[PDB]
Design an enzyme around this catalytic site. Structure first.
Site, PDB file in Angstrom:
ATOM      1  CE  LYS A  83       4.237  14.234   1.790  1.00  0.00           C
ATOM      2  NZ  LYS A  83       5.316  14.079   0.770  1.00  0.00           N
ATOM      3  CG  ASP A 108       5.480  10.090   6.399  1.00  0.00           C
ATOM      4  OD1 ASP A 108       6.494   9.859   7.090  1.00  0.00           O
ATOM      5  OD2 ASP A 108       5.532  10.284   5.162  1.00  0.00           O
ATOM      6  CG  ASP A 124       6.363  15.449   5.401  1.00  0.00           C
ATOM      7  OD1 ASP A 124       6.138  16.355   4.574  1.00  0.00           O
ATOM      8  OD2 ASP A 124       6.789  14.322   5.070  1.00  0.00           O
ATOM      9  CB  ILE A 138      -0.965   0.038   1.209  1.00  0.00           C
ATOM     10  CG1 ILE A 138      -0.188  -0.226   2.503  1.00  0.00           C
ATOM     11  CG2 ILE A 138      -2.091  -0.981   1.010  1.00  0.00           C
ATOM     12  CD1 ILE A 138      -1.044  -0.172   3.750  1.00  0.00           C
ATOM     13  CB  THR A 141      13.427   7.464   0.337  1.00  0.00           C
ATOM     14  OG1 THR A 141      13.333   8.177  -0.904  1.00  0.00           O
ATOM     15  CG2 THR A 141      14.880   7.432   0.792  1.00  0.00           C
ATOM     16  CE1 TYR A 142       7.533   3.516   3.517  1.00  0.00           C
ATOM     17  CE2 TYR A 142       7.655   5.524   2.210  1.00  0.00           C
ATOM     18  CZ  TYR A 142       6.990   4.363   2.574  1.00  0.00           C
ATOM     19  OH  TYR A 142       5.777   4.052   2.010  1.00  0.00           O
ATOM     20  N   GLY A 143      11.329   2.787   2.519  1.00  0.00           N
ATOM     21  CA  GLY A 143      11.086   1.360   2.459  1.00  0.00           C
ATOM     22  C   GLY A 143       9.705   1.078   1.905  1.00  0.00           C
ATOM     23  CD  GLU A 162      -5.015   3.629  13.929  1.00  0.00           C
ATOM     24  OE1 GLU A 162      -4.435   4.454  14.668  1.00  0.00           O
ATOM     25  OE2 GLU A 162      -6.257   3.526  13.876  1.00  0.00           O
ATOM     26  CG  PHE A 163      -5.172  -1.327   7.280  1.00  0.00           C
ATOM     27  CD1 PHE A 163      -6.506  -1.451   6.923  1.00  0.00           C
ATOM     28  CD2 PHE A 163      -4.215  -1.226   6.278  1.00  0.00           C
ATOM     29  CE1 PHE A 163      -6.885  -1.476   5.590  1.00  0.00           C
ATOM     30  CE2 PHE A 163      -4.586  -1.248   4.942  1.00  0.00           C
ATOM     31  CZ  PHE A 163      -5.925  -1.374   4.596  1.00  0.00           C
TER      32      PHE A 163
HETATM   33  C1  LIG Z   1       6.138   7.116   5.198  1.00  0.00           C
HETATM   34  N1  LIG Z   1       4.838   6.473   5.113  1.00  0.00           N
HETATM   35  C2  LIG Z   1       4.347   5.479   5.861  1.00  0.00           C
HETATM   36  O1  LIG Z   1       4.915   4.924   6.767  1.00  0.00           O
HETATM   37  C3  LIG Z   1       2.998   5.023   5.542  1.00  0.00           C
HETATM   38  N2  LIG Z   1       2.480   5.125   4.334  1.00  0.00           N
HETATM   39  N3  LIG Z   1       1.203   4.619   4.351  1.00  0.00           N
HETATM   40  C4  LIG Z   1       0.527   4.685   3.033  1.00  0.00           C
HETATM   41  C5  LIG Z   1       0.861   4.171   5.552  1.00  0.00           C
HETATM   42  C6  LIG Z   1       2.007   4.396   6.463  1.00  0.00           C
HETATM   43  C7  LIG Z   1       1.954   3.974   7.944  1.00  0.00           C
HETATM   44  C8  LIG Z   1       2.562   5.008   8.889  1.00  0.00           C
HETATM   45  C9  LIG Z   1       2.757   2.706   8.029  1.00  0.00           C
HETATM   46  C10 LIG Z   1       0.534   3.654   8.436  1.00  0.00           C
HETATM   47  C11 LIG Z   1      -0.560   3.325   7.404  1.00  0.00           C
HETATM   48  C12 LIG Z   1      -1.794   2.771   7.798  1.00  0.00           C
HETATM   49  N4  LIG Z   1      -2.773   2.502   6.875  1.00  0.00           N
HETATM   50  C13 LIG Z   1      -2.602   2.779   5.538  1.00  0.00           C
HETATM   51  N5  LIG Z   1      -3.597   2.537   4.651  1.00  0.00           N
HETATM   52  C14 LIG Z   1      -3.667   2.760   3.288  1.00  0.00           C
HETATM   53  C15 LIG Z   1      -4.359   1.813   2.479  1.00  0.00           C
HETATM   54  C16 LIG Z   1      -4.472   2.021   1.087  1.00  0.00           C
HETATM   55  C17 LIG Z   1      -3.887   3.190   0.483  1.00  0.00           C
HETATM   56  N6  LIG Z   1      -4.012   3.393  -0.900  1.00  0.00           N
HETATM   57  C18 LIG Z   1      -4.525   4.665  -1.428  1.00  0.00           C
HETATM   58  C19 LIG Z   1      -3.405   5.107  -2.361  1.00  0.00           C
HETATM   59  N7  LIG Z   1      -3.195   3.954  -3.245  1.00  0.00           N
HETATM   60  C20 LIG Z   1      -3.629   3.993  -4.635  1.00  0.00           C
HETATM   61  C21 LIG Z   1      -2.574   2.740  -2.729  1.00  0.00           C
HETATM   62  C22 LIG Z   1      -3.650   2.242  -1.765  1.00  0.00           C
HETATM   63  C23 LIG Z   1      -3.195   4.133   1.287  1.00  0.00           C
HETATM   64  C24 LIG Z   1      -3.092   3.918   2.664  1.00  0.00           C
HETATM   65  N8  LIG Z   1      -1.419   3.306   5.149  1.00  0.00           N
HETATM   66  C25 LIG Z   1      -0.415   3.579   6.024  1.00  0.00           C
END
Ligand SMILES: CNC(=O)c1nn(C)c2c1C(C)(C)Cc1cnc(Nc3ccc(N4CCN(C)CC4)cc3)nc1-2
Lengths: 257, 302
Positions: free
Chosen positions: B133, B149, B131, B14, B18-20, B85-86
């Site tokens: 945004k 983030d 950050d 998802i 750069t972070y991973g 958490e998701f």
């Molecule tokens: C530096 N970024 C992150 O750590 C980070 N990025 N995302 C997208 C998440 C994180 C965390 C900090 C690890 C927590 C998190 C918790 N839940 C989601 N959910 C999520 C699910 C689907 C999408 N999409 C919408 C954009 N897309 C087309 C891909 C699916 C984006 C976020 N995402 C995240």
């Protein structure tokens, strides 16, 4: 500031939790206060070499006292612990840390880069990544906003005293950062301006001059004996003009308490 | 540490950068759905990255409904995983999927209200996000929005210094930063939120600059070029030039036309030039704009 108060309240709560065990050094089989004193003095020196923030230094020491508070270490490893602590403190506080290579260099390659990274991992595990600890520095900052006229000489001298307290586990392990900061602040204000712990900070901190007294006495004593002390890196650091030469300032003969 | 990792079933990627990498994943034993961030720890051989050090230590103090929760940290020899958490979607994608229709105003209000609550919690715990945004703001089907983030986040019990390489993407960057201020303050996060507020309302970015100077000028062109009376100190600031064009402040009803008086008021205070005068998150929460706030659910196109 607008959260200035909420943040103080919160730092006052965290400083109780991120607090090392007061008596940990006597439960260490092999190391001692004197060795820790030598380590912290060395770290001050390192901070000066790589031009690190003072906050970094205080964090590194906090990590060390917490690590040693639950992990037995041997003399030959104490410095690896402190080196990893400094690396973590840098990573946390500095805009960008020195490279690991630099922390291997500063040890005369006593340890390998590999040992440093593994020790960093261990320290993180033992501290459970809880690196954002309250420091004397942070409380001093909060306190400084309470100088009616802000004085840079008072701030240097307060930093200087706060920094010295890092060196000697006896008696300063037994005091909270907020208390050491309170005593360092009043003492610096007293030496430089002749004024005392301000009523506005009494209301803010709930600390009376009476309450600070035991730490004050100790801190004053450390101030008096500083030129004699076996560790000197801090006095050296603080006779630079960057700190208004405050370590050259003569301590009061007595506090008016 | 390796058993923990074996308890996770990777579902789908998802997030990446750069972070991973971030995966949706499932705990095979509890069924809990989770966001698994994998930080690659061999890529530089510099130990645990500073961003991870800061994100982890700061995020575990910050437990709040509107901050994405860090649930767990798994640190093996060569891998670092954070378990979050998701959530369902980020705001950037949502705004883009809402282009035709617009985000309904009540939902915009609810979002801003929640983001402010989340931000106020950060700041009242001496954490600057730095950050903010749309893409770092995450939403679920129930109507919640949460800050995420914290890769650039910093504790400020001691003042945070400005770094060229660690700044918000240009569009949401506060004028202090562009003008070369020495320290960050909480006001930079409020500025970002204001920009995001405006962007949700109008469906266009407020200040979409092409460069640092172009970004300033877009700000000046809308809010008027700041002077000593508006912002004591501006002219002394490092990257301030006397050659700056002097634009007049655009009429604010024409900048965010959909907004009523309360919304215009709130946004004005969030975009105040002087950082000391820019409204705090806590005080914003009390603004009459949020008098009638509710919690609508989005139409998430999935
Ligand atoms: C530096 N970024 C992150 O750590 C980070 N990025 N995302 C997208 C998440 C994180 C965390 C900090 C690890 C927590 C998190 C918790 N839940 C989601 N959910 C999520 C699910 C689907 C999408 N999409 C919408 C954009 N897309 C087309 C891909 C699916 C984006 C976020 N995402 C995240």
């Amino acid at each position: 500031p607008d959260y200035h108060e909420d943040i103080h309240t919160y730092l006052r709560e965290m400083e109780v939790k991120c607090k090392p065990k007061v008596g940990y050094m006597k439960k260490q089989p092999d190391i001692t206060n004197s060795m820790r004193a030598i380590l912290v003095d060395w770290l001050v020196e390192v901070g000066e070499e790589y031009k690190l923030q003072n906050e970094t230094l205080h964090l590194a020491v906090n990590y060390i006292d917490r690590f040693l508070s639950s992990m037995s270490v041997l003399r030959g490893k104490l410095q690896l612990v402190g080196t990893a602590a400094m690396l973590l403190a840098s990573k946390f506080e500095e805009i960008y840390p020195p490279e690991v290579a630099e922390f291997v260099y500063i040890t005369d390659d006593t340890y390998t880069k590999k040992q440093v990274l593994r020790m960093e991992h261990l320290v993180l595990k033992v501290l459970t990544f809880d690196l954002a600890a309250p420091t004397v520095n942070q409380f001093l900052t909060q306190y400084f906003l309470h100088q009616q006229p802000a004085n840079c000489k008072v701030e240097s001298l307060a930093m200087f005293l706060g920094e010295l307290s890092l060196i000697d586990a006896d008696p300063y392990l037994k005091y909270l950062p907020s208390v050491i900061a309170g005593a360092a602040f009043h003492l610096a204000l007293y030496t430089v301006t002749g004024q005392s712990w301000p009523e506005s900070l009494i209301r803010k901190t709930g600390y009376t001059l009476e309450s600070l007294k035991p730490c004050l006495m100790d801190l004053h004593q450390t101030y008096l004996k500083a030129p004699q002390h076996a560790q000197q890196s801090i006095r050296e650091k603080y006779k630079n003009s960057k700190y208004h030469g405050v370590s050259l300032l003569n301590p009061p003969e007595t506090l008016n308490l | 540490p390796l058993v923990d990792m074996e308890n996770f079933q990777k579902v789908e990627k998802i997030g990446e950068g750069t972070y991973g990498v971030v995966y949706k994943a499932r705990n095979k034993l509890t069924g809990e759905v989770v966001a698994l961030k994998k930080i690659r720890l061999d890529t530089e051989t510099e130990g645990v990255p500073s961003t991870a050090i800061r994100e982890i230590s700061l995020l575990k103090e910050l437990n709040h409904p509107n901050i994405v929760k860090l649930l767990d940290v798994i640190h093996t020899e060569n891998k670092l995983y954070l378990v979050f958490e998701f959530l369902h979607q980020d705001l950037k994608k949502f705004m883009d999927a809402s282009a035709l229709t617009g985000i309904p105003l009540p939902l915009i209000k609810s979002y801003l209200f929640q983001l402010l609550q989340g931000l106020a919690f950060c700041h009242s715990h001496r954490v600057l996000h730095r950050d903010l945004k749309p893409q770092n703001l995450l939403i679920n089907t129930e109507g919640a929005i949460k800050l995420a983030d914290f890769g650039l986040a910093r504790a400020f019990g001691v003042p945070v210094r400005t770094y060229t390489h660690e700044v918000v993407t240009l569009w949401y960057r506060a004028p202090e930063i562009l003008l070369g201020c020495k320290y960050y303050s909480t006001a930079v996060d409020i500025w970002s939120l204001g920009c995001i507020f405006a962007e949700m309302v109008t469906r266009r970015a407020l200040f979409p600059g092409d460069s640092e100077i172009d970004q300033l000028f877009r700000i000046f062109r809308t809010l008027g070029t700041p002077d000593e009376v508006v912002w004591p100190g501006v002219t002394s600031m490092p990257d301030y030039k006397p050659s700056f064009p002097k634009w007049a402040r655009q009429d604010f009803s024409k900048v965010v036309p959909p907004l009523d008086e309360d919304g215009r008021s709130l946004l004005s205070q969030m975009l105040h030039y002087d950082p000391n005068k820019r409204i705090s998150a806590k005080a914003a929460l009390a603004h009459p704009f949020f008098q009638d706030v509710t919690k609508p659910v989005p139409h998430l196109r999935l």
